[PDB]
Amino acid sequence: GTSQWLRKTVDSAAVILFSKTTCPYCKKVKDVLAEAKIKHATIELDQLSNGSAIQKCLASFSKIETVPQMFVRGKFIGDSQTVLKYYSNDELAGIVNESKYDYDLIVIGGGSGGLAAGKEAAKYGAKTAVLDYVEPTPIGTTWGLGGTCVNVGCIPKKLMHQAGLLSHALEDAEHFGWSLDRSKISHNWSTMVEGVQSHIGSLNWGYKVALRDNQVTYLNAKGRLISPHEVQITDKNQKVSTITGNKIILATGERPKYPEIPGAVEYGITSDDLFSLPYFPGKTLVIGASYVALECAGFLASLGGDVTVMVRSILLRGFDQQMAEKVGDYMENHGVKFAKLCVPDEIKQLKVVDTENNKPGLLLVKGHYTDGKKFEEEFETVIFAVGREPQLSKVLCETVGVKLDKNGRVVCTDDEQTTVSNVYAIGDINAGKPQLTPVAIQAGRYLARRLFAGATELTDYSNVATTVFTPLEYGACGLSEEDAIEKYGDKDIEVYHSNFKPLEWTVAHREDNVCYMKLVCRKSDNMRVLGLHVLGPNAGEITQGYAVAIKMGATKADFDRTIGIHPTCSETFTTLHVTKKSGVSPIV
Amino acid sequence: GTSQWLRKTVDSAAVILFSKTTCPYCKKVKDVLAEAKIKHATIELDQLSNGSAIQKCLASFSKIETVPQMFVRGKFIGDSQTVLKYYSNDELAGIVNESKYDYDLIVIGGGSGGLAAGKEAAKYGAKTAVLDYVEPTPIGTTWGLGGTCVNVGCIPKKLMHQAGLLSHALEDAEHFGWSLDRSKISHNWSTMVEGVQSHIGSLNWGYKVALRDNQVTYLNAKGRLISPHEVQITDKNQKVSTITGNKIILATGERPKYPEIPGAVEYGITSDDLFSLPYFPGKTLVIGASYVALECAGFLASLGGDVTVMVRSILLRGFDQQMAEKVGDYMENHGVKFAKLCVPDEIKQLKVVDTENNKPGLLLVKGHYTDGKKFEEEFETVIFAVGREPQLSKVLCETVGVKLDKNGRVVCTDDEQTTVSNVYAIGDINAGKPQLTPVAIQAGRYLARRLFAGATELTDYSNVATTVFTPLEYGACGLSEEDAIEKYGDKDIEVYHSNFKPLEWTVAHREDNVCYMKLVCRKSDNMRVLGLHVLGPNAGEITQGYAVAIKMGATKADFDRTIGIHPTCSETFTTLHVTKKSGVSPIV
Ligand SMILES: Cc1cc2nc3c(=O)[nH]c(=O)nc-3n(C[C@H](O)[C@H](O)[C@H](O)COP(=O)(O)OP(=O)(O)OC[C@H]3O[C@@H](n4cnc5c(N)ncnc54)[C@H](O)[C@@H]3O)c2cc1C
Ligand SMILES: Cc1cc2nc3c(=O)[nH]c(=O)nc-3n(C[C@H](O)[C@H](O)[C@H](O)COP(=O)(O)OP(=O)(O)OC[C@H]3O[C@@H](n4cnc5c(N)ncnc54)[C@H](O)[C@@H]3O)c2cc1C
Ligand SMILES: Cc1ccc(CNC[C@@H](C)O)s1
């Protein structure tokens, strides 16, 4: 029925006021709470489908059925008159604060997900604390509040991606009539890092202010869940203590892996160090083949660097592989070299990194190909991008009872709840969910609404669009081609595709048939669009809008009746017609 | 019902074949028709929702009920045996060219819609001619086949727009670490015009080649409808003749208007001349407030030009005015000077345009503001953008019977048919249709299928998306805000909005709170999105995809449940919460 909704809501909420929009008694109580600097959620019963039933079940707690009723942490406080009797007796503050625990919510991890959840939580009166600590890299790198996206992920790579795109702007400017000469222009890595770190510092500080100004307690300490309500924190001065919270949210992210080979941890770096490195990396070897490894080799080339990528097997494993190879074939034609079907054996240090004069060392990389041929080349820097993983042993005592899948990730129900009942996990460590910063923000905000404001909304994790920020960007939404065929069979899958050329690339004398797009649709379902794929500039801005249509179950008919915006790259989606089965060429 | 469709198809198609995929006799006929280079439409009866009735209704024409059946211009030709007997006896070619008119279709106008139409009809066996003539401008500017967009519209304008954006890229490159100094680079106008014209020329040639390869007769002559089936053509030599056609499509577009003031036609120019001008315009007065006027003033300013814009009343009349005002504020903050509430009286000539040294003339402009105060200033170039109009006088003889609305645009039923039963109109001259290149193309293609292949699909003109390619671009889809309030009332309209700042603008030190987007919704229709509006970079790429979701009736919840792609500008549409009635600020 409706009853157990109301028991969960009243039991979980901190300060909550069942109210009416038109009732003047309720309105005077609200303004009392505002003047009292008392935050709370407000369930206005007159704008819900069955508010009349909810007033009936309110009597199951309060022996009354009128409005307003105020509750604090499961307890019925009183009706109108009762609460202002507390106010002009000055007993209100004592009763709204009193609680079995120190906090209504402890969040372990101050990243995209945790900070999102704590800021939405304190909005509804939940007494909240948020914990964040950055264990240093093996060479000692460190950064402030915000998470992986803010300090060592989406933010600084797209800015470094942007510095690389700008090199083609300088090339293109001549053909559009600008007097400059691209041949006479070099890049300065340190000036870039300083501007990138300046914007990161603004984000760091701005998060501390958001927490300060929302009544969230920020603790720069490493917390560890020892029991289902108990968190054991460690100071900057290694000082250890214990706080307690009613509800706990785990959101501590992942960190870079290294291969188990000698020299790796000692002499190489990872993405965590690349964004604040104080010297240009020089001649660089990137080991791996995920979006991290391509994106970084991507801009490192565009800034004049001598870049090699060492690929064990395939590029972008798990993405559509036609597009993967189109991505990779572009980078190879524009500077990035690849050593295909090759794997590393050890790293020898020939020269130490020169802190004083600000210059890299010199390394020797020993490898072998699959056939058995041997690799051996000198490199000034070696970056490892061979995956990321959580380390929940540092965060979670075995004995508390939280179930971990075979990767170390947290098994949650579809509302983010662990096996222990009052503990939840969001973000990269939620098992089998897409590891993206906008996902972690939605899970975090939609969970806080459910805990402290009686919400029902769940996070939808399906058909979440992505974009890979390689020199030519690749945005995608939905299934890949190979996956659609495997799920429904080659006969039932029809693919529309077509090359294109940006107008902007005409005067600039760029390639005619590298930019490509395709719609993978299902025949026996009115040609429903299953996945969408585009390789070209601004692929992120192109793809986004269609993510809404695809959540709404778009079909090829819907794309055909929508008119294009001319001249854009994106309008090519509105008039696709060549089918893969037909065999007709997709060139311009 | 089925009855009158079949009769309409058989009477207008040129060569049509009624068939089934499974049949081997029709496969036999297809193979013979393909061999003889005979182009035809082909219904596949075993693929239609009611082929049992379409088959049975065919007997009204062939006195037979089987398949295949081939018709030519309303006449039943024969079954399988009867067709091969014509083939094997050398009679089949003459039957399929037997026609009452010179052409199955004559298209008056070789621009966006007309080129699209003739090429589609040719592809179904229709014998087609397209006519195209470029009436020279007052100073005699003239160009090649393609239309207004190709030669003097979207294509050269976005290329000059792009030259303008690249000046901000040369600026921003400094702050991402590149050595260059923006302050010592200049722009060469003629080099850019050379590159742009070069690409226009390759479109001119491609369109000639495409009409050749579809066997479309291309007459570079001026056409004129003298009777429902008689078109009068006039040579480059003035050689007048007459051709006949079964179906006629009007697609003659528009041309720029001039104000009725002394010196306008003698000493000013329009956009028709600007895109191939041999000298730089210099100090320039732009008279108007349309998207033509602002887009041109925009890039002209970004190229180093001293630019002024003379506004009668408001900017972008017809578009959401809050957006328009923000568009104008940005230009005024980045160069362009505005003479507000001002109108011109006369243009005087102080200096004649110098062909020899390739420099502009010099003019004196006199006007007055709306309060009698005087305007007087010198400019080297004066560009009129005071609207456009057709001149159907020059193409449509009064006595044919084609009816015009009070603007001079053709009045059409929602299938593009005029008051005369066999004459149709597409593109700009179609009354009350949005005047855009993609609209013309879709109208022209969908019509040609209905006429020569039994199609039924109409063109949808509602909710067509637009982008104004000013220095900050502005893209939109659906109603303006004032329009939505006007139709439903303030109480029923809710507006969600937010500023934003592209990530690319952080390191480059650009403005914090200039970029803006909003969604206008209907409270009583489930918060249906009635209009989308965004101001910022790549606004065309941003908007296009969202047009599809609006076309399927997207609501606010649909935008909420879709996850953003990060870091993009476009992702801000997925987390909008501040409302206008709320009174909260939309800054960041
Ligand atoms: C190089 C790179 C580029 C990326 N680019 C993109 C991109 O373009 N778009 C995108 O959507 N995603 C991108 N991602 C992924 C994105 O960063 C993650 O999806 C997101 O950061 C996950 O957020 P989270 O809140 O789950 O974890 P995090 O953001 O990693 O937050 C976890 C935080 O908790 C801290 N912590 C850990 N253990 C403890 C502890 N015991 N006590 C206290 N605090 C602790 C961590 O130090 C960190 O501060 C990128 C990732 C990388 C590595
Ligand atoms: C500066 C500018 C910028 C624009 N930018 C955009 C944009 O970014 N996006 C967009 O969607 N739209 C844009 N437009 C509008 C776009 O150009 C039109 O919507 C489009 O050209 C409509 O095509 P049409 O076939 O109706 O007319 P047209 O393309 O003008 O075709 C008409 C053709 O018929 C010829 N003709 C005329 N009379 C005769 C005759 N008697 N005999 C033979 N031929 C004849 C004309 O010379 C012309 O070649 C822009 C317009 C301008 C002026
Ligand atoms: C013609 C114009 C209408 C609006 C313009 C720019 N806004 C100026 C305002 C802030 O005074 S220019």
Automatic annotation (TrEMBL), chains A, B:
Disulfide bonds: C23-C26, C149-C154, C149-C154
InterPro entries recorded: FAD/NAD-bd_sf (IPR036188), FAD/NAD-binding_dom (IPR023753), FAD/NAD-linked_Rdtase_dimer_sf (IPR016156), GLR_AS (IPR011767), Glutaredoxin (IPR002109), Glutaredoxin_euk/vir (IPR011899), GSHR/TRXR-like (IPR046952), Pyr_nuc-diS_OxRdtase (IPR001100)
Gene3D superfamilies, per database record: 3.30.390.30, FAD/NAD(P)-binding domain, Glutaredoxin
Positions with a binding annotation for Mg(2+) 2: H509
GO cellular component, one term: cytosol
Protein role: Has a glutathione-disulfide oxidoreductase activity in the presence of NADPH and glutathione reductase. Reduces low molecular weight disulfides and proteins.
Protein name, per record: thioredoxin-disulfide reductase (NADPH)
